Design a binder for this molecule. Structure first.
Ligand SMILES: Nc1ncnc2c1ncn2[C@@H]1O[C@H](COP(=O)(O)OP(=O)(O)O)[C@@H](O)[C@H]1O
Ligand SMILES: [Mg+2]
Lengths: 379, 54, 222, 394
């Protein structure tokens, strides 16, 4: 495959030497992709030679590349990126087919480690969004593709939270969610100014609010929405969650968590530790008469109000803050409470897992799955 | 209409400024419970068995 | 049995696109053609400050996008005048200078009137003097030794410098001779200018030296 | 005549009086309405008299006046962009001189306005978005700000930094207009770092305080916002009643979130009676009336951008309702079910004992209530003296 890769590289080198540069702004020519495959042939052979394939892109039982399974990889380009050639970019129908393949064939695979699966899907969605950006694509279909990318990242924000840092970095996942939502907001505004309305906008705007519960400025943005979007149920739920969190209404916050959709619950899971710490501070201050004496508080109340899995998790949470727990009665003491140094490890909430009643593919797709695409690439 | 228009002058030294001596009332937070809403709330509490002791 | 009562800042990730920086349409078109996703943390923190022509000192890991910040800034606030050099970028290695030149040639795709030149050690002074005399650039990227040599013999007119930039300034200022040459170059340039210095490992001992070159800078350390 | 106008321009430039040149460039001057000055190609005469780059600037100004006479604001905006660029080159050419600052006040302020017109003259054709001309004007104003701020070596009475704050305000008037904040951080940092912070003109200081107070209100910093908006409202010009009303629109929610309630006379005076019911409800702890009032004027509050901010009065309403419950029962040991009944009387959706306990715990923690909760007896025991301290001390 090395000879084929070098021949394709030479062909691209000649085609790029034919390319011109240093053009005026008015004479700009937007790129139109012409790649009919999920991954370009040159990239397939390149990663085959360099042994950089994921587990999903190889024929099972060997290191050979299943070309119909390989998906174009995000690579950050470089200062010598040499510009994207027309055949290195896949047009919008091919991008939609790639997203359908991802949501129908990959997001439900159980074999393979979680790190490999998450890395593959995240990198490939990044590549899809990069191809969208480089082609100046602004259409309902592109909006749908970026929406599916955002849904995948939202799901992974909770599904992968227990993994070690070498497998899943929460900060990078949150950054990816924020970038996807920024792209969605920009495309929503552009389409609205162009006279086109997106059905799913009211959903993802809500996600935006759920991703900015600690930023007050989001309130202003919520008041700038179109009246149909702002008065939608999703945005109303997001504003209710914002009000519950910022007012330290943990009972209302966890009631909203219980009555939320799967993706909304996954987004709200990021604030569980913060809201529980604030709730414990408030309860310890409010249920203790004096700094010298302690008061017994039912552990069942802590489990119910703060939405803990069972008495063991609540006991661990209370002990990590210095409070004694015994006989199902935590001894709240004003002089014994102390906020631990260093954030404790997060664990998946059982209720949010129970909210996942359909496959991951359907949750990411936002509806019933489309038929699995079947496209053998041409050599 | 949603614009902060430019001022006619550049400085006024405070002579031509609209004076609002008592703009914010401070004695609104009192123990007065004789208003209509207080009576309605007291009636509700009486209905639900919560009555001021004699 | 009731005892009477005894009388006695979380943050979020900021979100913005390159369109939110009010860049020139040519810069935005070149950015999207490059496939840039969104400003990073360093980019989001530094670009709004750098566009306004104010000094900045930045410390961040390699690959965070420190170079692109000052490239975009100096392309945004550029007033190209024939016969003058308004942006001077200095680094300690030829490879870094060529990377900066590639970035400038990459982001100035839709600015045909902008010229960038590179002067570095290992070549002859005659080529650099010919470049200055015949086709004077608006952006000059180089090493302190070559820049000092070109400025001492009155071949490079530094009196029109408006953007003084040091890339990977920590290891350039750690060296005594390189720091002395940088000091002389700074003294040759006019006072009314903006200074931007970026480095990957800004030791606390070098930080006073870096802040000596600026005036009320915005300092970012991660 | 055109010759007299050009000679007056030349004399003003030679004499270096900023006011005269600003008048000769500003559209506020009646000479723009003078029919004989408006010309299509007057650059030949400007080249003869004025030295560059002033000749190009004033030729562009004459073309701009001619275009404005025909109500072609796109051509006017292009001409004014030429004005700003030429004047910026000329102003940068000046060294240790700030006599041309008013001209920058006359030019840049005139650019933004034209952008608005151009903007509302491009919606009709549909070939442009809403704010592209504003973005270009913001770029020009950023260039002007860079030119003004880079001058840090001139004397105190001879520096261009006196033109900073004005330009900052102009940028604010674009950033809030095109709904593009977070570019205000460098401007605020530069103004705070500047030693001329309190020496700018009163109008520019008031405008800056108003905008930064709005930004601080949207950042939940209700003390810095309170201070800035109080300064803006106190020192606002008496003639500009619209500006006073606009400042008060954002000053009211901040003051109410801190425990200060506007009088009815204030709302009547500045035609802000939409708050009249809201201020009553928070005073009475009436959640139902507060919700009804916020729904009645929902369009007005969303237009002003304070509706969700006004929703934060719910905490003070809770405090007032619980204080009323305590005053009605007249006991220091209040059953939590009494508070539950009070909340149900206000038609709070999905309210139970757990949420009542959460609200009371938060009120106790924040210092609104001086008491504790006895879970065994399911009661609230408040301080016998000062159970509900004033909100001004919380
Ligand atoms: N916001 C961004 N989005 C996408 N790619 C970026 C972004 N910023 C930088 N890059 C790319 O990443 C590389 C980082 O290189 P450089 O700018 O030198 O970073 P640093 O100065 O931190 O080493 C550049 O080649 C650039 O093409
Ligand atoms: Mg770099």
């Amino acid at each position: 495959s090395k000879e084929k890769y070098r021949l394709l590289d030479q062909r691209d080198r000649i085609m790029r030497q034919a390319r011109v540069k240093r053009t005026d702004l008015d004479k700009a020519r937007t790129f139109v992709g012409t790649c009919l495959d999920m991954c370009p042939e040159k990239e397939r052979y390149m990663r085959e030679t360099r042994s950089q394939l994921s587990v999903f892109e190889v024929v099972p039982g060997t290191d050979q590349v299943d070309h119909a399974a390989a998906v174009k990889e995000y690579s950050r380009s470089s200062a010598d990126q040499e510009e994207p050639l027309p055949h290195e970019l896949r047009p919008l129908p091919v991008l939609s087919r790639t997203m359908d393949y991802l949501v129908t064939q990959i997001m439900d695979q159980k074999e393979g480690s979680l790190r490999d699966w998450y890395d593959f899907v995240w990198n490939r969605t990044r590549g899809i969004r990069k191809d969208i950006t480089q082609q100046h694509l602004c259409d309902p279909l592109t909006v749908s593709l970026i929406e599916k990318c955002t849904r995948f990242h939202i799901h992974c924000a909770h599904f992968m939270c227990e993994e070690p840092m070498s497998s899943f970095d929460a900060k990078i996942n949150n950054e990816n969610m924020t970038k996807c939502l920024q792209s969605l907001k920009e495309m929503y505004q552009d389409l609205r100014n162009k006279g086109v309305f997106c059905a799913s906008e009211a959903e993802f705007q809500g996600y935006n609010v759920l991703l900015s519960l600690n930023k007050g400025d989001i309130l202003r943005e919520v008041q700038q929405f179109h009246p149909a979007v702002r008065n939608s149920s999703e945005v109303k739920f997001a504003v209710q969650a914002f009000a519950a969190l910022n007012s330290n209404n943990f009972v209302r916050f966890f009631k909203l968590v219980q009555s939320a959709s799967y993706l909304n619950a996954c987004l709200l899971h990021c604030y569980f530790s913060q809201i529980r710490k604030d709730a414990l501070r408030a309860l310890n201050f409010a249920y203790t008469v004096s700094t010298q004496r302690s008061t017994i508080f039912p552990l069942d109340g802590v489990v119910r109000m703060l939405l803990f899995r069972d008495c063991e998790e609540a006991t661990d949470f209370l002990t990590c803050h210095g409070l004694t727990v015994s006989d199902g009665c935590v001894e709240l003491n004003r002089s014994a409470f102390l906020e631990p140094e260093g954030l404790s490890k997060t664990r998946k909430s059982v209720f949010i897992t129970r909210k996942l009643t359909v496959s991951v593919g359907e949750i990411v797709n936002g509806g019933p799955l489309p038929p699995v695409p079947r496209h053998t690439p041409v050599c | 209409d949603d614009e902060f228009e430019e001022f006619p002058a550049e400085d006024w030294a405070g002579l031509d400024e609209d004076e609002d001596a008592h703009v914010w009332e401070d004695n609104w937070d009192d123990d007065n419970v004789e208003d209509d809403f207080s009576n309605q709330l007291r009636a509700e509490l009486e209905k639900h068995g919560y009555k001021m002791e004699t | 049995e009731l005892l009477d009562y005894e009388d006695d800042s979380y943050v979020s990730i900021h979100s913005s696109g390159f369109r939110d920086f009010l860049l020139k349409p040519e810069l935005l078109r070149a950015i999207v053609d490059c496939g840039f996703e969104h400003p990073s943390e360093v980019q989001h923190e530094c670009i709004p400050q750098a566009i306004l022509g104010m000094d900045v000192l930045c410390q961040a890991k390699s690959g965070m996008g420190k170079t692109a910040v000052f490239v975009l800034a100096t392309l945004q606030q550029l007033x190209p005048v024939t016969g003058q050099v308004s942006v001077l970028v200095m680094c300690h290695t030829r490879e870094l200078a060529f990377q900066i030149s590639k970035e400038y040639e990459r982001f100035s795709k839709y600015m045909p009137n902008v010229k960038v030149a590179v002067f570095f050690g290992g070549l002859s002074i005659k080529k650099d003097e010919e470049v200055l005399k015949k086709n004077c650039p608006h952006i000059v990227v180089g090493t302190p030794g070559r820049i000092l040599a070109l400025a001492r013999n009155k071949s490079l007119n530094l009196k029109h410098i408006k953007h003084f930039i040091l890339d990977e300034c920590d290891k350039m200022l750690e060296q005594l001779d390189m720091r002395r040459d940088v000091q002389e170059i700074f003294r040759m340039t006019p006072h009314e200018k903006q200074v931007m210095m970026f480095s990957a490992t800004l030791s606390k001992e070098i930080r006073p030296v870096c802040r000596k070159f600026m005036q009320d800078p915005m300092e970012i350390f991660v | 005549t055109i010759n007299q106008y050009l000679q007056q321009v030349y004399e003003a430039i030679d004499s270096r009086d900023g006011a005269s040149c600003a008048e000769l460039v500003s559209f506020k001057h009646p000479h723009v309405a003078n029919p004989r000055l408006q010309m299509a190609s007057p650059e030949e005469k400007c080249q003869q008299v004025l030295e560059p780059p002033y000749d190009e600037m004033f030729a562009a100004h004459l073309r701009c006046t001619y275009a404005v006479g025909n109500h072609d604001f796109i051509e006017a905006y292009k001409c004014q962009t030429v004005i700003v660029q030429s004047f910026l080159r000329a102003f940068q050419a000046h060294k240790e001189e700030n006599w041309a600052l008013p001209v920058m006040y006359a030019v840049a302020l005139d650019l933004r306005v034209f952008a608005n017109n151009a903007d509302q003259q491009l919606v009709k054709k549909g070939k442009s978005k809403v704010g592209d001309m504003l973005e270009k004007a913001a770029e020009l104003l950023m260039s002007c700000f860079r030119v003004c701020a880079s001058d840090t070596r001139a004397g105190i009475e001879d520096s261009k930094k006196w033109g900073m704050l004005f330009l900052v305000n102009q940028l604010f008037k674009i950033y809030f207009k095109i709904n593009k904040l977070h570019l205000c951080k460098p401007l605020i940092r530069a103004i705070d770092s500047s030693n001329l912070k309190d020496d700018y003109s009163t109008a520019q200081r008031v405008t800056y305080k108003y905008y930064v107070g709005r930004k601080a209100m949207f950042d939940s910093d209700f003390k810095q916002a309170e201070e800035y908006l109080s300064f803006a409202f106190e020192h606002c010009h008496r003639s500009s009643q619209k500006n006073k009303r606009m400042i008060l629109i954002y000053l009211l929610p901040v003051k109410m979130l801190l425990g200060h309630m506007p009088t009815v006379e204030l709302l009547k005076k500045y035609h802000l009676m939409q708050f009249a019911e809201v201020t009553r409800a928070v005073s009475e702890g009436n959640l139902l009336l507060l919700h009804e009032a916020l729904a009645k004027h929902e369009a007005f509050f969303i237009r002003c951008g304070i509706f969700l901010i006004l929703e934060k009065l719910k905490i003070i309403t809770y405090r007032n309702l619980f204080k009323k419950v305590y005053l009605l029962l007249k006991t220091h040991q209040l059953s939590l079910d009494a508070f539950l009944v009070a909340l149900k009387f206000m038609q709070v959706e999905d309210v139970d004992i757990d949420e009542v306990q959460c609200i009371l715990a938060n009120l106790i923690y924040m210092g609104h209530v001086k008491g504790y909760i006895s879970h065994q007896h399911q009661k609230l025991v408040v301080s016998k003296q000062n159970p509900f301290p004033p909100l001004s001390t919380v």
